[PDB]
A = this chain, B = another copy of it.
Amino acid sequence: MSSTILVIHGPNLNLLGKREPEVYGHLTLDNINRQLIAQAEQASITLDTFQSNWEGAIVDRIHQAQTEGVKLIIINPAALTHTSVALRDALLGVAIPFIEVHLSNVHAREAFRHHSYLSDKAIGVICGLGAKGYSFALDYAIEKIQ
Contacts and interface: CB of A to CB of B under 8 A. Distances in A.
Contacts of A128: 99, 122-125
Contacts of A55: 53-56, 86
A2 B8 CA distance: 21
Given A124-B127, A125-B126, A89 B79 contact: yes
- Chain A contact residues: helix, strand, loop or mixed: helix
Contact of A139 (B117, B124, B125, B136): B136
B120 A105 contact: yes
B93 A119 contact: no
Given A82-B85, A128-B123, A129-B140, A1 B66 contact: yes
5 contacts: A1-B69, A30-B33, A68-B69, A107-B122, A132-B136
